[PDB]
């Protein structure tokens, strides 16, 4: 595989997908037993290890549809990965999305052309794998972790003169990130399972920041939910 320097078997059925390869390192080393690094290519670290005696891998994706598509493609095609879970965050675009909320994306809107390229006059709506979604949801409820289930917006431009998120907020969209559409689309295409779990980095519309302590907590809940949504 071109972008991942690993061997047959070095990668688990379940990969967790942060955007930052340093959060990849942090996650593995903080949460997992007998950790191994399998990829050092391009600094986009991946790691396999164990959680409750079950194998789990953690691969960085980079930022943007185009970067994540690369990793998801190779993970699926070259390493027969079965379940794929994005664990990152997003800018919240609604007031009712609270900074302690954990978002489970049923679907994703986008200004990426990726789907228009393949489909033309169809708006393809990507779709989370429901069984993973239900699991993650259950895992949250049973521990009373605050959870919201709805849609997000996979953007191409972080800095965006022509942002239409105001209109997206008005249609119930929860927050904007930059990966989900690609994950959900590529996974479904290959008959695989995928889900994005997200925390709120800030409220983008009402301006305000969230604190370091608030981020640590919700981060930690995201990884918890992800892990138990699986074991």
């Amino acid at each position: 595989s071109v972008h991942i320097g690993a061997e047959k078997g070095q990668i688990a059925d379940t990969v967790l997908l942060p955007g930052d390869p340093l959060r990849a390192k942090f996650i593995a080393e903080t949460y997992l037993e007998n950790v191994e690094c399998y990829n050092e290519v391009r600094g986009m670290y991946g790691f396999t290890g164990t959680y409750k005696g079950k194998k789990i891998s953690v691969q960085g994706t980079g930022m943007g549809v185009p970067s994540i598509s690369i990793y998801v493609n190779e993970l699926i095609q070259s390493y027969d990965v079965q379940n794929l879970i994005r664990v990152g965050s997003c800018g919240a675009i609604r007031k009712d999305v609270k900074v302690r909320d954990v978002i489970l994306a049923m679907t994703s809107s986008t200004d990426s052309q990726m789907n228009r390229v393949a489909f033309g006059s169809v708006d393809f709506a990507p779709c989370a794998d429901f069984e993973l979604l239900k699991n993650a949801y259950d895992a949250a409820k049973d521990k009373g972790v605050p959870v919201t289930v709805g849609s997000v917006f996979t953007a191409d431009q972080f800095y965006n003169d022509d942002s239409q998120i105001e209109k997206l907020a008005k249609y119930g969209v929860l927050g904007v990130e930059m990966e989900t559409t690609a994950l959900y689309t590529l996974a479904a295409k290959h008959g695989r399972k995928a889900l994005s779990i997200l925390t709120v980095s800030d409220h983008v519309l009402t301006g305000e920041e969230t604190t370091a302590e608030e981020r640590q907590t919700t981060f930690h809940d995201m990884i918890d939910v992800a892990l138990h949504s699986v074991s």
Copy 2:
């Protein structure tokens, strides 16, 4: 309201949405107590009645994004309707979608331009209200009704020289109907709740028909699921 001849209060918080106004009549009269017809405009019958002592209405929608949008718009704007549930069927486009399956749409793809008109370079992904979805799902599981959760395709043309459903099947899309995108989009826009529950009228790709008896059963399960997903 232009298309519905009813009075303030004559319509419930929860409306069920068949496409056929004669299935609207059938549903109400078969399932509901002390039934009343409130709309005779254009033959697109609507009915309010009672189920387990709780008010429920049933309004026909017509076929197509443009027709349902009319009814959904008026129901929401003129009659402050809170929950909206499409109960119809669809052509299945995958082999693994069985003729006894009951489909709960998390989202919908489309070749309707309705969203491109409002959004331009965004693929808007419509999103089912999750709380209704979960309810309907639970209601099925607890009675052991076979249920599938995924996406569908809201088409504009029934007869379609340029059908791309083959490609849609390959991405996990379950079946094609002609209403969901509109329901989900208009509902979310108005901060309301919506869901499409669907049965399989036929397999469109593998050609074969389903029998009258198979349709009666699954139909009956759809209305059951809808009702209990609410009470």
Copy 3:
């Protein structure tokens, strides 16, 4: 035929196409001899009968490109229908379109994606069959019925936050309805003949309503023109 429960021969060469299936019933029973109903499917009534000893049928279409396309498709493919005439109304978008005017559409603009789906980078301009147009025009002139000949706009959304009709008015477009583009496109594709004849339900831009009496008259003139444009 899937949507029409009729037998070979039960449907005439010339079908008149109201949107409302109750105007279908009204028209037939008010204007035609030895009337027969051939379709009760979905409440979308169709009727064959006689006018001046010549067979004429009247089929409801529903509202929207997607609904009418269904009926037009089946009428053409399953019942070898030769001439198709939409008789409905429209919202007028110009001041010079008077509430007593009868509109004959030479062509139609649209925000439906139906043609973009089939054609891509082509703006397909649908085209009325001229021989029917000329007839209808003659039939009006010879009785001195006020008649206007120009274009309309086939819309997808009745209620439309992103309405561009102001700009359409400025280019001479007369009024907005929701069926013509589909009729004209499907008819021409099958080497058949089609025409939309329309009355003014209201002025949409200058706001004002038209009265019940004004509508009865112009309605009656529309059906007159349609019938004589044929006999």
Copy 4:
């Protein structure tokens, strides 16, 4: 006016619009009394003269939407031109369009982006002014000149690897030229009157050429029809 070197009044209410400025010269000098040339700018000759004691002008347009738009724009804006009549030819794309036929375009399809630029998600259908159309039609019938009334295709590329005219033929489109959409669109926008009258230069699909003698005749009929459609 930038592209036309003429003075207030030097140009008539009725301008005839060939594409070739040498057919402009030919037309005027062959058909008109006391001829005057008013424009020599860019070689795109225009001429005013008299026909049956009534003033008529004849201005070359060039080939393509972009060129004709220039001349039509200036003629309308700078010289208050009221009626505009394209007299050129086209490649026929249907077998039933005979080489002696004279085409009156009710409307025009296009791959020009001109309308998509102004309108976005609307397919704008340009529309001939009916009163001119009727006149031209009458003028043909009364002299028994063979005449067809339908649509054409305004193309951007003469030589076209991606030609979709095969599909356009199947929808009843008669022939392809390169000016009409622009004429009809700009004229209607300015509350003016326009019409394209066309002869068949060749059959494009069935390959075959038409002879010099056949072209002279039909040409001559086109100019005849145009003139009498006015006097």
Copy 5:
């Protein structure tokens, strides 16, 4: 060749491409030895002659993507033309583009659909042939003629209610003309060499005109640069 009445060999490897066929005549007769006119078709004059003992031709193109595409297509396909150089002018859309500047276009933006037709979801960026570009640049520098190298905008509409040139100026685009995209695209497609050299007819945004004397000079420099960029 359909649009050019010339014989095998009558046209040089290097053709200069003004838009005006009268500037074509002027150029040849002012700059070239033993001049011959080979095309009189449609008034779009072409001329072959000699400059410093080397053959050079000069063909008018008309205005617009669609017109120039015709001439470029035939010149390339029918007369095996190798180098093609547009010598015209443009409206400047930036303050820093001075009225004495000579523009060499590396590339061109457009609202023509020509490339979208062939490519769909790709923005094709046309590309000047660099060897010609470098030559022309050198030829300017060595004589100290003021020269700017950047991009332009090939527009379809001269008069443009929906002009986006303000936004184009902000991205460094230098000026607007109506031919370059077509030249560069068709030339590259046929493995040929092309370049647009342009003078400033006016500043379009800041309104002001340039004088007749300023135009004569820069014109003369354009033709100079073109010729020496070749000998």
Copy 6:
């Protein structure tokens, strides 16, 4: 600045832009004096150091329009960067592009929607800053490094079922990468200077790989050209 943890002044006027943050480290440490790392955020290392007594920085960009846009945006907005030079490689899509060639992109095509989002019906052609281009070209020629000047294709999908590069090759496009369009577009928008210099990682169409030794050499020439194109 959100994505780069550096202080005012820590970053030079001239930044070199590899995609791989490990090639960023390699480049700096191999080519530059008194090297300093200023960014460790996300593993996307940036470094400032000295070359021939002049300050030069080297920042990784990630893969894809969306990732590079982030870094370019911050570098320009937060650190007033003046010149930006992408030094990476690309898949060659033409036979005449030799594995030892060094590509200087005058412009870039794309299937990214980034520009369509901002521009709509315009194909925006991004444009390299010519002064940097000329420098880099000169620097190559004077040392006799093999250099090609033309266009490339900025793709969104590395793995691409719907690849149109075959058609792009036919129009002279040299190779496909994933960053240039974004660089050139964002740089020009902010009145800055940018250039992509590229080596050939493989021939994508004719299949064959290039060797490790061939890559080391051309890589080394790319960095050489970049540096001297500046000093």
